[PDB]
Design a protein around this ligand. Structure first.
Ligand SMILES: Cc1cc2nc3c(=O)[nH]c(=O)nc-3n(C[C@H](O)[C@H](O)[C@H](O)COP(=O)(O)OP(=O)(O)OC[C@H]3O[C@@H](n4cnc5c(N)ncnc54)[C@H](O)[C@@H]3O)c2cc1C
Ligand SMILES: Cc1cc2nc3c(=O)[nH]c(=O)nc-3n(C[C@H](O)[C@H](O)[C@H](O)COP(=O)(O)OP(=O)(O)OC[C@H]3O[C@@H](n4cnc5c(N)ncnc54)[C@H](O)[C@@H]3O)c2cc1C
Lengths: 466, 466
C-alpha cells in the first residue's frame, strides 16, 4: 500500500480509476501461473489502483501525477503475458492502455494504431479496409493487445514467414511517452525502436504503433499425422523449406498431447499419433497436397474436406502457448519450457531432447525463420515435480546445445530474451530517471554490481556493437 | 516426316498466318546471340511460317492440321529467351501465342490468364484490380510472356522471396494441349505440371495458366556502394537474411561493370565501386536504412531521395541478364555464365571464382531462396576469346564446387536445368508421338543410347524417385 495513494487519486478527477480490491487484484495478474514457480513467488502481488486513460493527453496527466507522487506505474494491455510482465511488484498504479485503441491509418503495407487494439480487431479492420492483416500475432490473437505484444511478446503465428519482433522491419515506428516531470513524446524509428521491444514497459509507454501489414489470404487449416515425433518433425522442417508453398503456421505436437488434449479435433486423431499443424494459403493448398503425398505426410484433417466445422477451434489455438493451455486445462501439473534448436542441427537436437526426457516431457516445435534460416523453437510440455528437477531439465537443454529462454522467471535478464547492455541502461535513465516504470523487472537497474555482460544466447540482442 | 506446307495452309482459313521471309526470320530468332557459340550455330535457322491463333479452338485447328501434314511446330511467346529455345531447328511452323493473351480471373492470391500475356501487363491489370502482382518475373518484365517464362525461364526478380519456377506452389495449374491426331486438353496440377515447366514447349502447348499472386507494394530502388566485390557480396548476403526487411531484388554487380556500363546511373557511381541493387518495400525502407547503417552499407542511390527523374531505368533492368545486355551493348565481346554457389559456402566460393578469373570475368550475383536456404546464383560476365577458353572457364567452375548451367547450349539436357528422366521421356511420347513439337531440343528423344541419368546438379529435377 503505497503511502501517496490518497494524494495521487485527488489529482486524477475525470480519469477513470478503480480501487476495488478484487478488481485491482484481477487486473494485477496475468497468466504467470502457467509457471508453478511464478504461481508461488508472485501470489502476493497486487496493485493499489487501476488507471485507464482514454487518450495520450490523459496518459500524460496520469504519468505527471505519478511522477510527482513517486507512485510506481506498471503498464497493462489485457494481461495475457506468461511471465508476470504486467504484474506490479511494488504495488502502485496498474496503468491500463486498453481504452487507447485508435486505428488511424491503413495503407498498402502498413497500419498505425494505438496500444490497446486487440490483435484480432486490428485484422478485422485491415481486412475490411483493403484485404490486409498483421504479419504475425500471438496465439492469444483474440484477447491480446498490439502494444502488449510489442512490449511483452516475441512472435507467433506468421513467424514461419517473417521471423519475430526481434527482427528489423517487423515494427516500423513506436511512439513512446516517458516518465519524467514533464512527460516527453519520443518517435522511435530505425534501430531506436528496438530499445523498447520486449522491455516490459520499463522504458516508456507505447502510445502509437506503426507495424507492417501482409495480405489477408484464405488460410486453410490442416493437420498431418505421424506415427512418431521424429517423422513429424522431419516433415514439418521440409514443408517449412518449401519456398513456394505459402504457410502461416507450421507446428509439431508430439503424442500423446494431440489425442489427450486436442479434445474437439479428437475425431480426426488416433492414439499414438503426433501431428503437424498447418495453415496454408488457398493459392498454395494444391501444392501442399502434392508435396505431402510425395513426402509421406498423411493429411488427417483438412478444413476444406472435414465437413461440419462447428465447434472446432482454429488450429492456431492448438499451437504456440495455446498447446500448453490445452494440456494444463486437463492436467494442471503440466508446465513448459522455451527453447531454440539452432540451425542446422534442429532435427538431431529436438530428437535428442525428446529421447532424454521420456514421459516427463512432451515435445512441441514451432517452425520459424530465424536469422535467415528455417529452424524451430520449442515449447515442450514438462510434467512439474520439483523446482530443482525443472532447473535441471533446463540446464541439460543448455548443456546439450539447445538454448533456454527461462519462462520461470519474471525479470528481463533472467528470461533470456531482452539483453541488458549500456544502451538499455542509459535509455531507462532517459525515459524513467526515477525508476517508477515497472520496478523490479530489470535487474541491472536495481543492482549496479550485476554482471549484465554474461548470458550466452539472447533472443533480443542489445544495440551496442563491437 | 512428310511435310506439306501447302495443305497445312489450306486447312487454316480464318487463322492468322505470316509467310513473309523477313518477318518469319525475325520471329524464328530469340536472344541466342548473347552466346557467341549459339550465334554461330543457329545463324541459319528459320521457320517457314508464323501462325498466330487467337483462341484455344484455333490452336487446336493448327495442331490437328500440323499433325496430319507433318509440319513441325515450335512455340513462341515473344522470343526473349537466351538459349534458342523458341528457334525452329527443323523449319515448319513458328506457333506464336502472342494473341492468346486474355486475362480471365483475378482473385485474392491467384490469377488465370493466357500464355501470351506480357508480365508487366499482367501486373498492371492485377494492380489496378486489387493491388496484386506476380511473385516473380524475369528482368525482361516489359517484353516477356508468362507462358514463355514458364516453358523457357526459371526465376528472377522476386526469387529472393519465393524461390523459382522449379518450386512447388509458384505455378498452380497449366492447361496444356497435346500434339496428337485429335489434340487433347490436359489440366495439369500437383506434381504433373512440373513435367511442362522449363520443357521448352517440347511436350505440349500451354493454353491457360493459373499462378499465385503476391501483394503489390511501393517498391523502392536503392543502390549500395562498396570498394570491393567481397564486401558487397557479404552485405547482400546479410540483407537477404533479414527476414523482416521485405525486398524484391538483391543483386551484386562487381566493378568495373557498374561504372563502365550502368550509364544512366553514372552520376551516382564512382570508378572502382561494386554495387548491390536493392528493391525494398516502402514499409521496410526505414528498417533497410537502419540495417545498412549498422552493416557498412553506403546508400549511393535511393528512389525516395533522388526526385522524379525521367530517363532512369528501374534497377531491375540492370540486374539478371539485363546486366549482360548492358555490358554487351557497350562491348559486344562480353558473354555470360550461369552458376550456382551452393549454400552455405557461397561467400567463399564467389570470392574464389572472382579471384581465379581477374579481368576476364566480372562477378555478378543474384540472391535468392533456393531449397529453403538463402544463397546466390551467378551470371558472371566473361570476355569472349575462344570457344575452348569459355568451355575451360566452365569446367573450372564445376571442378571448384560451383555448378554450371551451360547457356552456350540449345538442348534441354546440355543446358543443365531440365533433367531428362523416364517420366519426362514418357510424357513427350504421350503428348507428341510424332516428335513434331520443337524437334532437336531434347537429346534423349533422338538418342536411344543417351545416358540421361548422368549429370550432377539439375535445376529442375525430374519427378521420378525410389
Ligand atoms: C495461451 C497463451 C498463448 C500465448 N501465445 C503467445 C505467442 O504465440 N506469442 C507471444 O509472443 N506471446 C504469446 N503469449 C503471451 C501474450 O499473450 C502475448 O505476448 C500478448 O501479445 C501480450 O499482450 P497483452 O496485451 O496481454 O500484454 P500484457 O500481458 O498486459 O503486458 C505485457 C507486457 O507489456 C507491457 N505493456 C503493455 N502495454 C504497454 C504499453 N502500451 N506500453 C508499454 N508497455 C506496455 C506490460 O507492462 C508487460 O510488461 C501467450 C499467452 C497465453 C496465455
Ligand atoms: C536481357 C534479358 C534478360 C533476361 N532475364 C531473365 C531472367 O531474369 N529470368 C529468366 O528466367 N529469364 C530471363 N531471360 C530469358 C527470357 O527473357 C525469359 O525467360 C522469358 O520469360 C521467356 O519468355 P518469352 O515469352 O520470351 O519466351 P520465348 O523466348 O518465346 O520462348 C521460350 C520457350 O518457351 C516455349 N514456349 C513459349 N510459349 C509457350 C507456350 N504457350 N506453351 C509451350 N511452350 C511455350 C518456346 O517454345 C521456348 O522453348 C532474359 C532474357 C534477356 C534477353
Amino acid at each position: 500500500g503505497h503511502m501517496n495513494i490518497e494524494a495521487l487519486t485527488a489529482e486524477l478527477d475525470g480519469i477513470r480509476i478503480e480501487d476495488n480490491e478484487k478488481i485491482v487484484q484481477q487486473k494485477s495478474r496475468d497468466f504467470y501461473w502457467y509457471s508453478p514457480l511464478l504461481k508461488r513467488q508472485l501470489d502476493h502481488v497486487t496493485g493499489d489502483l487501476v488507471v485507464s486513460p482514454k487518450t495520450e493527453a490523459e496518459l500524460i496527466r496520469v504519468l505527471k501525477a505519478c511522477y510527482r507522487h513517486e507512485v510506481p506505474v506498471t503498464p497493462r494491455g489485457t494481461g495475457t503475458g506468461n511471465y508476470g510482465q504486467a504484474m506490479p511488484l511494488s504495488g502502485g498504479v496498474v496503468l491500463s492502455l486498453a481504452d487507447m485503441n485508435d486505428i488511424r491509418e491503413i495503407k498498402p503495407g502498413w497500419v498505425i494504431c494505438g496500444p490497446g487494439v486487440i490483435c484480432s480487431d486490428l485484422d478485422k479492420a485491415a481486412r475490411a479496409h483493403s484485404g490486409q492483416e498483421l504479419r504475425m500475432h500471438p496465439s492469444t490473437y483474440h484477447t491480446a493487445t498490439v502494444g502488449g505484444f510489442i512490449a511483452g511478446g516475441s512472435g507467433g503465428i506468421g513467424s514461419i514467414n517473417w521471423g519475430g519482433l526481434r527482427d528489423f522491419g517487423n515494427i516500423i515506428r513506436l511512439r513512446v511517452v516517458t516518465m519524467e516531470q514533464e512527460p516527453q513524446v519520443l518517435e522511435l524509428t530505425g534501430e531506436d525502436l528496438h530499445k523498447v521491444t520486449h522491455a516490459y514497459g520499463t522504458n516508456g509507454i507505447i502510445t502509437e504503433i506503426e507495424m507492417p501489414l501482409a495480405p489477408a489470404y484464405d488460410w486453410i487449416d490442416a493437420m498431418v499425422g505421424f506415427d512418431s515425433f521424429d517423422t513429424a518433425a522431419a516433415y514439418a522442417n521440409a514443408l517449412a523449406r518449401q519456398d513456394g508453398i505459402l504457410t502461416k503456421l507450421v507446428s509439431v505436437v508430439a503424442a500423446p498431447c494431440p489425442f489427450d488434449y486436442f479434445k474437439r479435433h479428437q475425431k480426426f486423431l488416433k492414439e499414438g499419433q503426433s501431428v503437424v499443424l498447418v495453415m496454408v494459403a488457398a493459392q498454395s493448398h494444391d501444392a501442399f497436397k502434392a508435396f505431402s503425398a510425395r513426402s509421406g505426410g498423411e493429411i488427417i484433417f483438412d478444413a476444406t474436406t472435414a465437413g461440419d466445422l462447428k465447434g472446432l477451434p482454429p488450429l492456431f489455438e492448438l499451437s504456440w502457448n495455446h498447446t500448453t493451455l490445452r494440456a494444463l486445462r486437463v492436467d494442471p501439473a503440466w508446465t513448459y519450457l522455451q527453447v531454440l534448436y539452432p540451425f542446422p542441427n534442429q532435427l538431431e537436437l529436438t530428437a535428442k531432447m525428446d529421447r532424454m526426457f521420456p514421459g516427463e516431457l512432451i515435445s512441441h516445435l514451432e517452425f520459424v525463420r530465424f536469422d535467415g534460416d528455417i529452424t524451430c523453437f520449442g515449447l515442450p510440455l514438462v510434467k512439474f515435480t520439483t523446482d530443482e528437477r525443472l532447473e535441471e531439465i533446463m540446464d541439460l537443454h543448455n548443456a546439450n546445445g539447445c538454448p533456454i529462454f527461462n519462462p520461470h522467471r519474471y525479470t528481463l535478464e533472467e528470461g533470456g530474451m531482452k539483453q541488458t547492455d549500456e544502451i538499455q541502461l542509459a535509455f531507462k535513465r532517459e525515459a524513467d530517471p526515477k525508476g517508477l516504470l515497472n520496478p523490479g523487472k530489470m535487474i541491472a537497474w536495481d543492482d549496479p554490481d550485476y554482471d549484465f555482460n554474461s548470458g550466452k544466447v539472447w533472443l533480443f540482442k542489445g544495440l551496442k556493437q563491437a
